[PDB]
Each structure stands twice: as structure tokens, then as C-alpha cells.
Amino acid sequence: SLSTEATAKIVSEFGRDANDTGSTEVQVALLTAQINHLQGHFAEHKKDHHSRRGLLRMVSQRRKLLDYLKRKDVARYTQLIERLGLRR
Amino acid sequence: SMQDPIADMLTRIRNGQAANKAAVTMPSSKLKVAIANVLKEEGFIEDFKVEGDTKPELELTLKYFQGKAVVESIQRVSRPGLRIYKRKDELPKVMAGLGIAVVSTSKGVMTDRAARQAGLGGEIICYVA
Amino acid sequence: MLKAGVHFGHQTRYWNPKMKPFIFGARNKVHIINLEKTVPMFNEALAELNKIASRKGKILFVGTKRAASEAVKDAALSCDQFFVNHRWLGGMLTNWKTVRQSIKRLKDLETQSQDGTFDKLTKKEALMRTRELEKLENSLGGIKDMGGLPDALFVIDADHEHIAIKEANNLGIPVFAIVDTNSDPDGVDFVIPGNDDAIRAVTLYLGAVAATVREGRS
RNA sequence: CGUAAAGCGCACGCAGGCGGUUUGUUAAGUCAGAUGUGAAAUCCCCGGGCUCAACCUGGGAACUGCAUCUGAUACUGGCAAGCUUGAGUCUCGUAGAGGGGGGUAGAAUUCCAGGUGUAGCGGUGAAAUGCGUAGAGAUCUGGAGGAAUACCGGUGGCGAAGGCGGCCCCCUGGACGAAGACUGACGCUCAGGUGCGAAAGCGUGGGGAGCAAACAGGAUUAGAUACCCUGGUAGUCCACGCCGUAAACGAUGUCGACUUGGAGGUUGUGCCCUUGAGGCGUGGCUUCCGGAGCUAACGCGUUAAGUCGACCGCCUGGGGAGUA
Ligand SMILES: [Mg+2]
Ligand SMILES: [Mg+2]
Ligand SMILES: [Mg+2]
Ligand SMILES: [Mg+2]
Ligand SMILES: [Mg+2]
Ligand SMILES: [Mg+2]
Ligand SMILES: [Mg+2]
Ligand SMILES: [Mg+2]
Ligand SMILES: [Mg+2]
Ligand SMILES: [Mg+2]
Ligand SMILES: [Mg+2]
Ligand SMILES: [Mg+2]
Ligand SMILES: [Mg+2]
Ligand SMILES: [Mg+2]
Ligand SMILES: [Mg+2]
Ligand SMILES: [Mg+2]
Ligand SMILES: [Mg+2]
Ligand SMILES: [Mg+2]
Ligand SMILES: [Mg+2]
């Protein structure tokens, strides 16, 4: 789900300004925030495989976006991943 | 997912002859204008334009004669899944020489008949019967 | 130039996709055929009709759809050529050599009724003979005086009388005709756009034809 | 590779393959040139010698190759800086049996208790088993339960496929449209892998009306271990696991481009006078009919089985066998 205001905040933290929204870092941030907000919904139900599938979609989306970001510039990439809380 | 723009050009022309459309409008590229330049100079296409700015939508003007469209056939050869680079003498003649085969060489894109004079060959792009 | 009456196109939704050059959209949810392209078409077609008429070539004016048949018969008997206003028997051209004896039959029998055996067998027999006579007289009457093969097959329609076109197109016979929006200009050579179901349209075209052919004997 | 053998049930996705557009560079592929080599014979060509031939034999070409060397630089690759038409994010809405969790209502069947009441009820082609004067069937009342949700409902909708329909709340997925905004090729496919996957089935604990394998009886029949009838257990229902299969079928892989029309359905939005249940447009999904073309034919036909491109899967006579 993720509220519209939530996104309004997240953008103004991972981009240039409120006007921007399409940059990679912003997209990844969004994906991760939503995923984390979804962790709960799968704490129970568990049989919800369709919602699940939507999740998996946004997850692989995130891995692709991150992979690109890395190949483009490892520097700020290391910043992003170190901040967003992930990686093995 | 639009893996091969050239074959797409050729197939736009092919469906444009089958449907007998006048102009064929397609996104442009240097190789596009080169190949279209070859077909034009050879006489397969009556004129063309690269009209467009940041998104050059070059359009070709297909030729006809009697009732049948001029282009006999136009098969893409050196597809991206299988590049073909013929040697000088190895350059094939199409329809015993009355049909040019657009071939890209170091001197530029040209007909094979010309590449027989240029003393050199290169990637054969497309047979045009 | 719109010479006189109305004949813009007609039909409605089911326009034949082949006739894109000669269509427009009327507010009455029905197409209106362009006259601009039409004028040179029937002009040049009439020119060809005058050329082949000077060639003294036999012409067939094919027609049907009831009300048009009269216009057809009028445009041939008023002129000098030939006509098939009624049922167009399949294979009367590419299968012409049996139709040939069908005609021989018509002529010899219509002669037999006018002076010969008028009731010799039985009154019933006379009835049957008059009957069959009238049948062959209206079935293949307009082609009776031919005995050869038409130099040109002018048709009153295309999509409806498709068999006449496909048949006369099997051999060296030009087949220019007035076609409607839903018609196919495939087998047809010199296409003449304009509506067809109207009587004024067929009287107009066919009459112009009468003029141009009527000049061929001079 | 729709129906002849042959698209994995569906998806996600690593390696791999392939990749829009402009400029620079490099020159890996590619191409041109040169030199070295490519043993001799053999093969081929032109001569010579055995009386001819075979065979022998001189010269030549050939040895489709490989390597270094100097060039070319269009196309591809690498590196660099980019562009926006691919892909993606944001904003406003729209429709929906999409999913999961929790409630809840009505009709009905069955059971239970009692009232009224009386000999049949039930079933079938007919009939019997079956139920019934211990009072059934019919009927009325009260109750208890489980399961599925008439009407709406539609070649209607949604979902990747399987699949999903009473109503309600709660959590939640995706699709689409409008005007923009921004990212800058982040794409497509995908072996191995991972997930999902009707029904039946299996395990554990519940539930059990109806229905119903197995089973039993009655018939029918030459027989009837079936069809038909009367019963009836597992199963069907719930929770959690497993199974991993279907004619999992538009028998039709996915993504992209292009190529005449018609009638519809469903769902948005722009526009025009709503000037009257309308008029003219623009997207998404979907049904039927058909043109060019394709096809062995049937048929398909802008949601192609047409015209092409990328990648993957699979086929190679029937049987043995999808078995050991
Ligand atoms: Mg098969
Ligand atoms: Mg499939
Ligand atoms: Mg890759
Ligand atoms: Mg490129
Ligand atoms: Mg090199
Ligand atoms: Mg040797
Ligand atoms: Mg000798
Ligand atoms: Mg040599
Ligand atoms: Mg380069
Ligand atoms: Mg480059
Ligand atoms: Mg912008
Ligand atoms: Mg696999
Ligand atoms: Mg089951
Ligand atoms: Mg069980
Ligand atoms: Mg499993
Ligand atoms: Mg199977
Ligand atoms: Mg199959
Ligand atoms: Mg069809
Ligand atoms: Mg087995």
C-alpha cells in the first residue's frame, strides 16, 4: 500500500526536491519501504499467494534497479545500500 | 523487444509493398539513412526524407510500376543472432546479378556490385531481389 | 461537373475496403462518392467506348435488379448494341458455344410460331410452345443478334453481377462498368464510381454510353 | 512444432544469448594488403613416356588453413560522455467472482420434539428391495446442524496459470485512463534454479446435512460382479502440511514491429448544444464474421496460424514405451 504522504516524505529524502520522483535512488527507496510495510501482511495470512506475487515482482524490480545503479556508480550505490538496510 | 531495427525497416517496406501503402514512416538512424540511401540510389525507392527533430521519423516513398510493387523480395541476412561477413570475392550476387545486395564495408554502406570494384568486402546486410 | 441529378454513393457501413480513394462520410451515416475523381473516369471510359464503337465492336450491356432492367433494354434497343437485362446465365461467354445453339433454338422456334406450326400438335402444345418461346425470348433475347463474342462487356454493377465480370475477364474482353461503394475494382478495368440502386444514375451513365456508342456508326 | 511426431501447466529469475539512439576513442571481431608457412605423393589442368589403356611422369594450379606485419573503420564488441521515442517512478481517478483473514443472512435438504390425521408412501420402462396402522407419506409449529450460495448472470468481469461468484468489515495484489513530472536503455529472453499449480489422493486434528467411490440388497440380462432403484463408508467441508499431476486446451512459448474492414461486448477519458433516453473522437480488454496473405486441407485472419526479429522449449515412422 504505502500512503501518498509517506511517498511524499520519502521522495524528499532520496532525490533532488519534491518536484523530482523518477530517480533510481527514489524508486529503490520506495520499493524497500513498501516491502518492509508488507512484511507484516505476510506474518499472518501466509496463504496469500497473489499479493505475495505482487511482492516478488517489486522485489526483483528492486534487485534490477539496484544492479543498474551499482554498475552505473558503485560509490553512491554503497551509500544507498548501506543506508537502506540490506545486502548480504 | 525491437532487437533488430534494420530487419524492422525491411519488413516495414515489405508490408508496405504488400499493402501498397504510399509512404512508410519509421524511426531513423545513421545505418537506416545509409541503407535507404543505397536503395534510393539503386532505384528501389523513389526519394525519401529524414524529416524530424529530436525524434527523426524518416519516411520512404515506395515505388510501383505496372500493378506489382517494384520490390521483388528483400530478406534480411546478417541478423543480430547470426552475423555474416563475406570476403571480397565471397560476396554473393542476387538473382544472377540483377538484384543488389546491400553490404556494409569499411568505405561505407554500398551495393555488392560496387564492392566488387572497391576491391573489398564486409558484413552483408540484406539481399534485395 | 454534376450534370444533373443525385447519385452520390449510398449503401452505408459495409463499404468495400478496396474503394478507399472513392469514398467520403455523410452525416446520414452513409458514404458519399467523390465526383472530382469520377468525372475523368467516365469521361475517358466514354472515350474508349467511342474508340471501340468506331472499331465496330459488339457490346453487352449487363443489367438486373428489376427497375434497372428497363433502363438497360432502353439503352440498347434505342442504340444498336446488345443487352442482358434479366437473368445472366452463367457461362454465356466462356461457355458461349452451347448458348450458341440455345440461341439457334430461340430464333428457329420464334420463327416456327410466327408462320409455321402455330397449333398443329395440340392447343396445349401451342400453349407450351408460346410459353417456352417467351422464356427463351426474355432469357437470352438481347444477345440473339450477336453470334460472335462481345468486344466490350459494359455492366450496370460490379459486386452484384460478379459472375459476368469474372467470366468476361477470363478472356480478352475489357469490362469497364459503373461500380458502387461496396464493389470490387479487381476484375474491372476502367472503373466508373457512382451509386447504382438509383434509376436516375443508371439512366444517366447508360444514356451517356448510348450517345458515345451512337457516334461509332459514323 | 493449432489438428499429422512436436510449445514445458504457469510464472520469477542467476549464468548464457541478444539489444534503441547521437558523439568520441579504441581496433577485439570484420575487411584489404604484404611476407612466412600450408612436406612429397594423391585430386584437378596442360604436356611427355610405355603399340593403346591402366600405370608412370614434367610443369602448373590447388592445398578452401594458420600466424605475424602495415592499413581501413562503415557494421558489431570494449571504454567514455550523453539523448528520448523502450523500460520505469510520481500525481488523480476508474471498474472488477484478484487474493487472505474475520463476521453474517435467506431459501432448501436431513435430523429431532410435539400437534392434526390416515392408509399407503417411495421408486421405475415396469417392478422389487426400502419405509408404513409400533402410525409413515402429506401437514403445522419449535429446534439443531452442516454445506452451497437461486434471481442478478451475460462468448460479462478479474487473475500469470490453476482458478474466482449471497452480503459486510479488515489486510492486500495487479491492470487501465487523463494531463503532466522525473530517471536515463535500468531492456527482452532464460538452461540449471525458485515459486505457484484443478481434481483425486496422503498425513494430523476437527466436522459431517446433502452427495457419494467401496460395499449391500432389488431388479434387468444368457451372465450384469455395470447401466436403473433402495441404502450407504471413505471422500467432498475446516485448520496445517504433502503430493505436483489433467484434453493444466485459444491442443497455439515469450517479447517487439508492421500489415485492408465490419458488427458487437466491457471499461475509461477528450470533445460537441444536456441543446431531447444524443453527435463526433481517443485508449484498454474481449466475442463473432470475413480481405490480402498464409495453410496439406480444415481453417487463421491487426488478441494471425500473415510479414519479420530475439531468445527458450520440443519433434525426428508405428509398436516395445513414456516402459525397464
Ligand atoms: Mg500431435
Ligand atoms: Mg501454454
Ligand atoms: Mg544478463
Ligand atoms: Mg546499436
Ligand atoms: Mg584486428
Ligand atoms: Mg602437397
Ligand atoms: Mg600416349
Ligand atoms: Mg601457385
Ligand atoms: Mg566502434
Ligand atoms: Mg560504438
Ligand atoms: Mg522531464
Ligand atoms: Mg527452467
Ligand atoms: Mg482435494
Ligand atoms: Mg483428508
Ligand atoms: Mg509442494
Ligand atoms: Mg503432461
Ligand atoms: Mg499441450
Ligand atoms: Mg474468420
Ligand atoms: Mg515412469
Swiss-Prot record, chain A:
Any GO BP annotation: regulation of translation
InterPro entries, per the entry: Ribosomal_uS15, Ribosomal_uS15_bac-type, uS15_NS1_RNA-bd_sf
Keyword RNA-binding: yes
Coiled coil segments of this chain: none
Induction (UniProt): Part of the metY operon that extends to pnp, also has its own promoter.
GO terms for MF: rRNA binding; small ribosomal subunit rRNA binding; structural constituent of ribosome
CC per GO annotation: cytoplasm; cytosol; cytosolic small ribosomal subunit
Family affiliation: Belongs to the universal ribosomal protein uS15 family.
Name used for this protein in its record: Small ribosomal subunit protein uS15
Protein species of origin: Escherichia coli (strain K12)
UniProtKB/Swiss-Prot annotation, chain B:
Function: One of the primary rRNA binding proteins, it binds directly to 16S rRNA central domain where it helps coordinate assembly of the platform of the 30S subunit.
Gene for this chain: rpsH
Highest taxon of source: Bacteria
GO cellular component, one term: cytosol
Cytoplasm as UniProt keyword: no
BP terms from Gene Ontology: cytoplasmic translation; regulation of mRNA stability; regulation of translation; ribosomal small subunit assembly
The protein's name: Small ribosomal subunit protein uS8
Native organism: Escherichia coli (strain K12)
Similarity field: Belongs to the universal ribosomal protein uS8 family.
InterPro entries assigned to the protein according to its UniProt record, in alphabetical order: Ribosomal_uS8 (IPR000630), Ribosomal_uS8_CS (IPR047863), Ribosomal_uS8_sf (IPR035987)
Curated annotation (Swiss-Prot), chain C:
GO cellular component, one term: cytoplasm
Residues carrying N6-succinyllysine: K107
Keywords of the record: Ribonucleoprotein, Ribosomal protein
Entries under Pfam families matching the protein: Ribosomal_S2
Gene Ontology terms: biological process: cytoplasmic translation; ribosomal small subunit assembly
SUPFAM superfamilies according to UniProt: Ribosomal protein S2
InterPro entries assigned: Ribosomal_uS2 (IPR001865), Ribosomal_uS2_bac/mit/plastid (IPR005706), Ribosomal_uS2_CS (IPR018130), Ribosomal_uS2_flav_dom_sf (IPR023591)
GO molecular function: structural constituent of ribosome; zinc ion binding
Family from the record: Belongs to the universal ribosomal protein uS2 family.
Role according to the record: Required for ribosomal protein bS1 (rpsA) to bind to the 30S subunit.
Subunit structure: Part of the 30S ribosomal subunit, contacts bS1. Some nascent polypeptide chains are able to cross-link to this protein in situ. In collided ribosomes contacts ribosome rescue factor SmrB.
Protein name per Swiss-Prot or TrEMBL: Small ribosomal subunit protein uS2
Lineage: Bacteria, Pseudomonadati, Pseudomonadota, Gammaproteobacteria, Enterobacterales
